[PDB]
Design a protein around this ligand. Sequence first.
Ligand SMILES: *[C@@H]1O[C@H](CO)[C@@H](O[C@@H]2O[C@H](CO)[C@@H](O)[C@H](O)[C@H]2NC(C)=O)[C@H](O)[C@H]1NC(C)=O
Ligand SMILES: *[C@@H]1O[C@H](CO)[C@@H](O)[C@H](O)[C@H]1NC(C)=O
Ligand SMILES: *[C@@H]1O[C@H](CO)[C@@H](O)[C@H](O)[C@H]1NC(C)=O
Ligand SMILES: *[C@H]1O[C@H](CO)[C@@H](O)[C@H](O)[C@H]1O
Ligand SMILES: *[C@H]1O[C@H](CO)[C@@H](O)[C@H](O)[C@H]1O
Ligand SMILES: *[C@H]1O[C@H](CO)[C@@H](O)[C@H](O)[C@H]1O
Ligand SMILES: *[C@H]1O[C@H](CO)[C@@H](O)[C@H](O)[C@H]1O
Lengths: 286, 335, 319
Amino acid sequence: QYEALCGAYAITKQAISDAEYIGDTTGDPRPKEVEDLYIMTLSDEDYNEKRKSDILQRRDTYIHSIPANSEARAAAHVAIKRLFYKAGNLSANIAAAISSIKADTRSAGEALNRARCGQADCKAPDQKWFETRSKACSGTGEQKQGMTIASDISCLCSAATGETLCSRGGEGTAANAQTDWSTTIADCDRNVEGKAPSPAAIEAAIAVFRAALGNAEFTAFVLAACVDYTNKLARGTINDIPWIEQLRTAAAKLAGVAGTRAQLDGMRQEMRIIEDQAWQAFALAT
Amino acid sequence: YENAKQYEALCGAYAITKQAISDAEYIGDTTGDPRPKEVEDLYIMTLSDEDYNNKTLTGVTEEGGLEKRKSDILQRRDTYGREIHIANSEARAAAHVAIKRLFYKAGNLSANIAAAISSIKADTRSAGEALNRARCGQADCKAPDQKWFETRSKACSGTGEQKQGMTIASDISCLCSAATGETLCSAAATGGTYRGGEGTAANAQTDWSTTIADCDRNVEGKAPSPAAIEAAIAVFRAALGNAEFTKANSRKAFVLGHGSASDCNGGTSSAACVDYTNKLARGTINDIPWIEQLRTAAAKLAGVAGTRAQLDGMRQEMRIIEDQAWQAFALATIP
Amino acid sequence: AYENAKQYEALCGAYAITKQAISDAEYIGDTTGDPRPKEVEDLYIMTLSDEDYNNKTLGLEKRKSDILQSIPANSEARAAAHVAIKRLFYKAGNLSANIAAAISSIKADTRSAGEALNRARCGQADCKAPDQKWFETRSKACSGTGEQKQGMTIASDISCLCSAATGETLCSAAATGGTYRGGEGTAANAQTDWSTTIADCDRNVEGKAPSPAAIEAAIAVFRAALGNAEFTKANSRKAFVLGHGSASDCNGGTSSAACVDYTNKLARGTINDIPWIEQLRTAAAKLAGVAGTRAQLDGMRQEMRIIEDQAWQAFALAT
Ligand SMILES: *[C@@H]1O[C@H](CO)[C@@H](O[C@@H]2O[C@H](CO)[C@@H](O)[C@H](O)[C@H]2NC(C)=O)[C@H](O)[C@H]1NC(C)=O
Ligand SMILES: *[C@@H]1O[C@H](CO)[C@@H](O)[C@H](O)[C@H]1NC(C)=O
Ligand SMILES: *[C@@H]1O[C@H](CO)[C@@H](O)[C@H](O)[C@H]1NC(C)=O
Ligand SMILES: *[C@H]1O[C@H](CO)[C@@H](O)[C@H](O)[C@H]1O
Ligand SMILES: *[C@H]1O[C@H](CO)[C@@H](O)[C@H](O)[C@H]1O
Ligand SMILES: *[C@H]1O[C@H](CO)[C@@H](O)[C@H](O)[C@H]1O
Ligand SMILES: *[C@H]1O[C@H](CO)[C@@H](O)[C@H](O)[C@H]1O
């Protein structure tokens, strides 16, 4: 077999790229113009920073002025005061939304890693990744079945009677599994160029796993073999078996990045709108 | 122990049909959808003494609340101080048309916003009817009764009248009901009633809410997703196969069963099968009646996502219309 | 009998998407908001000063009388509302230019996507009529014995998988190709074994607009069907074969021989390296970029309409 096992390894060894979701970062801060225009409309008390220098210069053609010190300067100010506040109070929402995405992506990254490696220590092959071959692949004494992606490449790919079909029944092959990890990866780690994670790719891998579920050897939701996920299955759902649940939790956090993406793009457009709104309000002060 | 994977596929499809599509999961918040009260309140301001009265009955905007608020709009809702919310300069009149332009546009958008909501309401209910039409033979799917199955001969083997795939239940009933019993489909999977070729849909109903137990305990608190429908078909097509049958009209890969059969309208454990060759003529699994309804529901669930994008965009225009109204209101505050 | 249909249907789904039209106009809304709003151009002349008001710097009088069904009075706003309109005027001027580039970017992206679909089905971006250039020899298209032009086209893999001597409705619900028999690659014989084999797919086509997800979905369908666990000797990776089973060659005489052994063409175990899936991915990627550019297009149209609203607010100062 050995098809969904290495496939899930590539999906767990994908690359979460926060930058490909956050995107612009240029319109996210409060537009400099709605801040420069604001100061020039501060009447004759608050205006009198080293930033007044950048304003009233850099015409960019070959841009700003102190308007009439009448009520129109304050009349324009109260118009842009909300425009100034709206950008600043929207940039915080954009920044908070970015932190939501960054938390979700890494959390989905942790779930993707914790699905394969232990916690997040996949930099080196911990021995806790692989367990005994009676309580982890058979689950007799303790119900510790099918824990990780690599916790299943031990059974059906160790012991005897196999012509690399999956490229110590009862005992623990922890070190042999550590060696079998090197042999197994050699038939893997090709990756898929690590393009990006996708919630559909997790469901597709999950669905592909459900296809290979089944075997007609001697001791129903199984994959000799020594797998028998029915040990910890409890109710038939794979929502109990660990690595499927960890993959699903990662998809749930990854599902939220698109929702914040639609919110985030529209908020940036509003900032671009608030720029154009402000210039047509500086004319209020003639 | 025999037809376990096939049940897992059908139970997966049943799960989505048992899932509910709440309308508000797509419509969302509607407190900002209507015409903003700020742009309305600003419109009463730039009106002068004339046209500002209850007796303007010939033209009234939303003054069915007997006006009243016309003079009470000038409130004091601010910070520790009171600032917000009208003389009668030429700027007052010149600001009215600027508000009137956005006052119209906000109201038009409110109608357009409501129009997109009605599209979502219709599509979701139309989609909801489709999922039901797969689980039952109706758009309601209420009582596990009322004969939404058919005879064994017609529904499982397609001998008399080609009626395979009519409902996900019929395919579940045929696959999990035979004389020979085991943990074939589920734990309590014997299905003794629906055994003979003459076995009517009543027999299936009598052993329906006994083999469907695990499925209803496994439907989780999620919502149907168009990928979930396509996923449900993927596990279904993966399980379709039984290399043993009746030669002609035995196109396998269209058989949901096991072992030598020669029939699926019988008592043998093997006859716990459904041959679709007599319905899947075109050659596609997607021609099974509950597959099309699954795809019909998934298609409608993709349509509401786009209308949601239109709905969200309209509320953005409404909100920036509210801000632009204050800009036009600042025209009047000129000496 | 039908012994490759599970493999055939996966290939037929891809052929269905390639035989589908993207309709370059479905991703555009209208040519109303795209051009510069004439009202802003109209309001430009109502405050276009009194000098340069009819001085066309190489007409203006016809446009100044065009406004017939307020007054271009010489006040401050005649030069104090023009500046606000000027700021808006060229902002919408660049915006409509960017809109035109976005439309051209969409059209170029859809054509490149549509070319890729034709490239996967046929080998060229012009799927006009069945040509011998579409297929190649068994040695190349199916068995990989002599050259590695294996996954060139879906059309060659279909002809390799659904054509052999021994074959009763091997797939396609009607007949089996009887000329592409063994070393006789005869790409012309694969052309004779084409219209008979491909007629079911020319009925499975529907009004399903070519979508990025459907292309990735059909690839998953092919992934499931990719397998032949018996096959033959070294460099015969059994997971990367598409056939009945228990063979030693591909496209020979046996129905089993109707197989495609990508082992020689494939590398790093990535099916996303067979020619047709590559093009399918290229088409899917470009189609996604169409969605992104269309999202920009509607956003730009939104900014143009608000610019026109700002024009009156700027122009209302002249009263
Ligand atoms: C894009 O917007 C800019 C905004 O300035 C336009 O630039 C002006 O174009 C007018 C055209 O008659 C010239 O007279 C000005 O000298 C330009 N000013 C500057 C600062 O560039 C420009 O025309 C717009 N369109 C394009 C294609 O650039
Ligand atoms: C924006 O936030 C400031 C405080 O940071 C607050 O004083 C102001 O009222 C807010 N205005 C808006 C429009 O949100
Ligand atoms: C819709 O727009 C038209 C434009 O003439 C306007 O007369 C009408 O009042 C608008 N709708 C509403 C509900 O205001
Ligand atoms: C299913 O039922 C048949 C007929 O009784 C039996 O022969 C098989 O052994 C069983 O699995
Ligand atoms: C399916 O049923 C047949 C008898 O029809 C039996 O021989 C097989 O063992 C069973 O799987
Ligand atoms: C190819 O399939 C045919 C069916 O027509 C069978 O007769 C052969 O044995 C097989 O190789
Ligand atoms: C495929 O063709 C081989 C040729 O030997 C035959 O043995 C198999 O029975 C058939 O399916």
